[PDB]
From Swiss-Prot, chain A:
Swiss-Prot/TrEMBL GO biological process terms: translation
Keyword Ribosomal protein: yes
PANTHER family hit by this protein: 60S RIBOSOMAL PROTEIN L3-RELATED (PTHR11363), LARGE RIBOSOMAL SUBUNIT PROTEIN UL3 (PTHR11363:SF5)
Protein name according to UniProt: Large ribosomal subunit protein uL3
Encoding gene, per UniProt annotation: RPL3-1
Record InterPro entries: L3_arc_euk, Ribosomal_L3_dom_3_arc_sf, Ribosomal_uL3, Ribosomal_uL3_CS, Transl_B-barrel_sf
Length: 363, 196
RNA sequence: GUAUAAUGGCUGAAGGCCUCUAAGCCUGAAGACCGACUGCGCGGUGUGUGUGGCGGAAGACGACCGCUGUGUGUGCAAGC
RNA sequence: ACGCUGCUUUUUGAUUCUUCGAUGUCGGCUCUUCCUAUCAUCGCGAAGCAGAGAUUGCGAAGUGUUGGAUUGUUCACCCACCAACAGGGAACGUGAGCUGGGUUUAGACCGUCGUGAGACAGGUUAGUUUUACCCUACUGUGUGGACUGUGCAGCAGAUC
RNA sequence: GGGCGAAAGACCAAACGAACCAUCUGGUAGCUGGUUCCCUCUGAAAUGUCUCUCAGGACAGCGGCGACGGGUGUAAGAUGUUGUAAAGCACUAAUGCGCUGCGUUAAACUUUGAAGAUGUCUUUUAAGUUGUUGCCAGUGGGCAUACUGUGGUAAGCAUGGUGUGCGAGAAGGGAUGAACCUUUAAGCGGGCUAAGGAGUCUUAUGCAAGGUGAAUCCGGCGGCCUGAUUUUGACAGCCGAAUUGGGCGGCGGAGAAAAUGGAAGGGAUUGAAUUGCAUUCCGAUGCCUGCGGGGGAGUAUCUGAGUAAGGGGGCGGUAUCGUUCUGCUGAAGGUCCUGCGUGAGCGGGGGUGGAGGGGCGAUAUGUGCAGAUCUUGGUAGCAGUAACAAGGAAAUGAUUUGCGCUGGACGAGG
RNA sequence: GAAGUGUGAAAAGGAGGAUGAUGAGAAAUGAAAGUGAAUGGAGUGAAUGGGGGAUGUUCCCGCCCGUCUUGAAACACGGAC
């Protein structure tokens, strides 16, 4: 009855039920806390996943601590981020039932990629603008803008249909938030005006899909011994006689992957443009940010990009949401990068810079 | 067939003694709305009321909590559930009686100049513990309710603009009074009275 | 992040003295509640969906993500 | 100490109310959940508490509590590690989940008992593990836009 | 009841520790299952004796149906019997001291001795109003409770005594329950109560006083009983007025630890879960009162629950003899609609059908179905599901090409 | 060691369908279980029943029969129609 040899349970109940996500662009669950003693800025951005590579880094300890300088090799992810466009304003007031949204201000000319997302692909078949601006100034506890991406600048996605979202505006004086966004309607805002190097960031996206999966893979339970009749990939006992029902905490077979996940404390390493040479490294060569042959199953990076440390949710060409940290951050160690690898990721590439391959063989 | 409507105000009212009387009105075909639902009180100490709400939260279907009992933390939703369990609500005569009830925190805007009533037996000053009680809004804010400062605001703004409307009305009662005591006034009205 | 348990304290009677307690107050836990994170119903709104075909990052079948002729073939690049 | 008063339902008895036109009877392996009468980890008292190491008490069930030799064993007993290697319930949890070593009809050997056919909770060896395609439960999936609010339900890091 | 066996009780035409086929044979069964229409009047036992008797039977007890026939299941006045409870030491058996008293006991001890039981006389005491006999059934596992014993650490344990219940007893109440409290049985009206209750589910009012599971400990109260101290200055540490020790009766707090989330019936309640009250009210199929129906009775009336079981009066199938009618101008059967009857059942109307069908009296019976792992026939759900097949191609296919391995003769059997 | 009788007075005639002919009549009668088509009403509650009222429901009451048994709605047995 009482069960000798205890062990931890297999998997977490924080994420049950494990359903598919209902959308490819999940909306953020919270926004940072407004400090109205700063200038006005934005708190997020949307980009697209390209691929992974190397970097070598010098661990600054050159004080006479027993290890002056170490080398450290770290994996990174590259995301391609063309500039976004602002086309609206939104305010929220406070009631006894919570946040109530006020009528919305549209700019002068809504793009053709914003109309396909709102009304489908076959959509083609004033002072009232000024009165609505006064409400967001009298009322409106908090303010947000409506932004959209420009997927037609990355012609390996094949979209023409934009992703749109609401992003909070931080910085004080609600009448100052509004007039900063009135002088920005129909114009672009770039990712270098939002995030900076050596900062911690959050990501939000959807994971790689796997379909219908067995229970050895979905939860990590043991296999049965080799003599066993009726198969070995399964759980042996799904409950006691009483209660005379199966519980929600038992492991079963079903959908694995394509879930909504939020990850936190990813460190930013570099911010550049794809149509120029990456540098700030301590070696001489030119080397744009894209490997020999290209990123596998992706084209080249020709717009702005951002580089962060480690793994990042999702598949190649899928959209991701970037958010500023909600926690307290201390400093960040000093970052010194001195080499970025750009060999071929198809096979075992041994050259950087195809001109270097051309001078090895001769002809 | 009935079409009567009553607005009930709960500010110093014992919550159980009000619920038992509001449910007998609903069964006899009267429409009720209870306003200021966060100001009803519970006789006793806050340590005794938190221990009783904590045992309520413990009740939970182990097999599948999505089928299980649902614990509401809003004052308007919680006091509506006390009235529901005063009666047999699974049967069709009880389903109809629950269609005649509305509950609010604070006072909504449409019910601004209409008269409110109190229940004569639920005043906390008739018990032996006047000055030892907890309001429904302080107890529930310690388990998750957020909008307690936005409810006191909305009620005072309506009270003040319901007091100004009383000053305009009272002064006209004095200007009309002098007209009734006039000279050309009476000799006129005595003519209309003359033709019966 | 807020309020607490055991314990330790402040002011203070009953009981002219005394006392952390009867009214009140300060502090305090891998615990409680809340936040953050995932899922579902219901609401609101200057807002209501490409019949078919073809693809995929999606998929047992339904569904989901895309376009509305830009495929196939061939050349170069990058690899075994 | 000598005496006296209780609680639990984990032992083994006592009883014979339910089931003999059948409720699959020991242990292990696998997997989930609950109790506190707390072993470790967090907070805090006492001392015949100098320090160090331990001993005794209170709040507290969130998270942990292992790898081997001999035995079918439960149990037991040793070796090594460890923050620590606590105790229990769920039809003595769990055989249309497995395995079948114990028990285990029909073959056989030994000891004791019987004139004999045969007997022994005495030892030994060889001995078929059937069927879901139904209802419910549970896991996904379907039940006809775009951007969001807010109620309910779940819930994660722990230790050296 | 024989065979055959390098032996396993193996094998002898898919069952072998005694094959198969027909008969005797509807073999016997103290054991299991089933046993067919309505209304109405009465109504049990689960105990004693004997039994190869113990899951059975006989005899006796309790009940039904009769028939015939004239004259006390309670008390009072008198007078007998008894050896328990309690108590006691007079006998039998026990038990401490002091050197005559004090102390402790008894199912198998009794000098005493109840309450209660039990005989007889007198209706020439009260109050009330049966004898003899015939033919026969079911039953012989009981159980609960108030009070009262015996065995057992104890038990929803086992076994006795007296009454009343369930059994064979509905209905109202106790949230729910065979047995608890009220009360004994659904016709149509009018009145009133019982148990239990009157915030809300849910029919229906108030007034008052306190308050906010064991040993073993702690506190309180305009409560009560008993003592002590004090204006000649107490108690506490000069001050100016009450201070204090033991107990008792209500009330509260420690002692107080279990396994899915959970229960004064629930939401709740500071008296809407405590105590004391009554001048109001609600509440049965019970009571009173007016009609209707049955059965008794000596004919102004009284009386209705019921298993096992027994008696009276009715409804329906098929025929005979014994009388009396109807059908081609459309019978029976079948289907829908409609009247009468407490009921078993009996009539009429419109389609369909295409040849016979009834009433009343006596008489003969293979005479009435929901059940028997009932017999035979037909039909559902499961379910368009499990299972099985879809063999390499070329518009055509006597042509081209791709794959597999049995191929050809005699006998038995067909 | 079974199961299986019936066009009509007359063949006066049919036998895939449709259009027709003959006949007094398309032709022994033709129940229940169960099903298809059309049309009226209701539903997301297991269903079904009694009282009281009504062109479905809303209030009250109501666990599945037969049997053995001290005792059955029974996690006692028999029972798809």
């Amino acid at each position: 009855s009482c069960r000798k040899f205890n062990a931890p349970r297999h998997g977490s109940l924080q994420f049950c039920p494990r359903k598919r996500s209902k959308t490819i662009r999940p909306a953020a669950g919270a926004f940072p806390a407004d400090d109205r003693s700063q200038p006005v800025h934005l708190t997020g951005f949307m980009a697209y996943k390209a691929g992974m590579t190397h970097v070598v880094r010098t661990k600054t300890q050159v004080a006479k601590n027993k290890q002056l300088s170490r080398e450290i090799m770290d994996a990174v992810t590259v995301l391609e981020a063309p500039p976004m466009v602002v086309y609206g304003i939104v305010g929220y007031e406070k009631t006894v039932t919570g946040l109530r949204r006020l009528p919305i201000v549209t700019a002068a000319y809504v793009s053709d990629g914003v109309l396909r997302r709102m009304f489908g692909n076959r959509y083609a078949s004033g002072s009232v603008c000024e009165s609505r601006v006064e409400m967001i100034k009298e009322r409106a506890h908090c303010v947000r803008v409506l932004v959209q991406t420009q997927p037609t600048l990355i012609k390996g996605l094949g979209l023409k249909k934009a992703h749109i979202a609401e992003i909070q505006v931080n910085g004080g004086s609600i009448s100052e938030k509004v007039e900063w966004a009135l002088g920005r309607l129909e114009k672009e805002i770039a990712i270098g005006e939002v995030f900076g190097v050596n900062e911690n960031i959050d990501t939000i996206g959807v994971t790689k899909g796997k379909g219908f999966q067995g229970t050895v893979k979905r939860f990590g339970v043991r296999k049965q011994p080799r003599k066993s009749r009726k198969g070995i990939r399964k759980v042996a006992c799904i409950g006691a006689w009483h209660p005379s029902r199966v519980m929600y905490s038992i492991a079963r077979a079903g959908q694995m992957g394509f879930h909504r996940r939020t990850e936190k404390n990813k460190r930013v390493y570099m911010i550049g443009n794809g149509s120029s040479n990456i540098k700030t490294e301590f070696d001489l060569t030119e080397k744009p940010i894209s490997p020999m042959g290209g990123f596998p199953h992706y084209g080249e990076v020709r717009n702005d990009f951002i580089m962060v440390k480690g793994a990042v949710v999702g598949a190649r060409k899928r959209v991701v949401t970037l958010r500023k940290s909600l926690l307290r951050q201390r400093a960040g160690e000093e970052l010194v990068i001195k080499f970025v690898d750009t060999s071929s990721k198809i096979g075992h590439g041994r050259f950087q810079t195809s001109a270097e391959k051309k001078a090895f063989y001769g002809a | 067939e009935k079409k009567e409507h009553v607005i009930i105000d709960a500010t110093g009212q014992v919550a159980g003694k009000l619920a038992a009387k509001v449910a007998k009105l609903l069964l006899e075909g009267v429409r009720v709305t209870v306003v200021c639902a966060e100001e009803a009180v519970f006789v006793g100490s806050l340590e005794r009321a938190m221990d009783k709400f904590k045992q309520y939260l413990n009740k939970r279907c182990l097999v599948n909590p999505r089928r299980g009992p649902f614990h509401f933390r809003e004052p308007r939703m919680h006091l509506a559930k006390i009235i529901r369990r005063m009666i047999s609500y699974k049967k069709p005569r009880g389903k109809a009686a629950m269609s005649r009830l509305a509950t609010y925190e604070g006072i909504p805007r449409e019910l601004e100049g209409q008269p409110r009533y109190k229940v004569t037996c639920a005043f906390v000053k008739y018990t032996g513990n006047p000055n030892r009680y907890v309001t429904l809004g302080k107890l529930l804010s310690m388990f998750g309710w957020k909008h307690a400062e936005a409810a006191k605001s909305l009620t005072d703004e309506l009270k003040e603009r319901e007091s100004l409307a009383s000053l305009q009305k009272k002064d006209l009662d004095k200007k009309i009074e002098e007209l009734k005591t006039d000279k050309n006034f009476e000799n006129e009205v005595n003519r209309r009275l003359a033709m019966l």
